[PDB]
Design a protein around this ligand. Structure first.
Ligand SMILES: CN(c1ncnc2[nH]c3cc(F)ccc3c12)[C@@H]1CCCS(=O)(=O)C1
Length: 167
């Protein structure tokens, strides 16, 4: 039993809710919140900008030190950093950004990072400003992640479309 509330069950291990991931993280304080990161961990907009704003920019300060030490992530890769006031840990995962021309096949590799964590609160990778089809992202999530994932979808209209079209 866990504290996630109001989710619709899609499969054995994948759950979905119309919610603001920032507000959901603040309430649940999950072990892991996933960020929709880029390779530079520049948290300017989308989910990343919202999560970073909620940490009063502490996420960005920590991220800049990480990049100065380690260099950029790979598209499809991830790193574990602090969850600050939102979660124990933040798993920063880089899905391909279609608006930069990155290979959508890398979306499966991105979701594989979730399997290193037993339970996660997450957005749909490569959705939103990353330019992928969120219905495709949900399909890859369900077909790739084997651990327990609680997906937060900000847009109510999109949430309803994702549920109604789910096979
Ligand atoms: C981006 N995205 C999110 N997913 C969950 N939580 C969020 N919080 C946010 C705060 C922002 F400022 C921007 C965005 C999000 C967000 C999802 C991708 C398609 C649109 S969506 O919004 O339907 C779901």
């Amino acid at each position: 039993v866990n504290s996630f509330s109001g989710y619709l069950k899609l499969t054995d291990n994948v759950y979905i809710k119309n919610a603001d991931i920032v507000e959901e993280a603040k309430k649940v304080k999950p072990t892991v919140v996933v960020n929709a990161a880029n390779v530079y961990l520049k948290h300017g907009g989308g989910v990343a900008g919202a999560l970073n704003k909620a940490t009063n920019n502490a996420m960005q300060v920590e991220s800049d030190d990480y990049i100065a030490t380690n260099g950029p992530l790979k598209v499809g890769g991830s790193c574990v950093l602090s969850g600050h006031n939102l979660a124990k840990h933040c798993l920063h995962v880089v899905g391909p950004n279609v608006n930069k021309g990155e290979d959508i096949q890398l979306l499966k590799s991105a979701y594989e990072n979730f399997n290193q964590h037993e339970v996660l609160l997450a957005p749909l990778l490569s959705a939103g400003i990353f330019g992928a089809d969120p219905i495709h992202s949900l399909r890859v999530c369900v077909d790739t992640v084997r651990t327990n994932v609680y997906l937060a979808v900000f847009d109510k209209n999109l949430y309803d479309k994702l549920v109604s079209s789910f096979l």
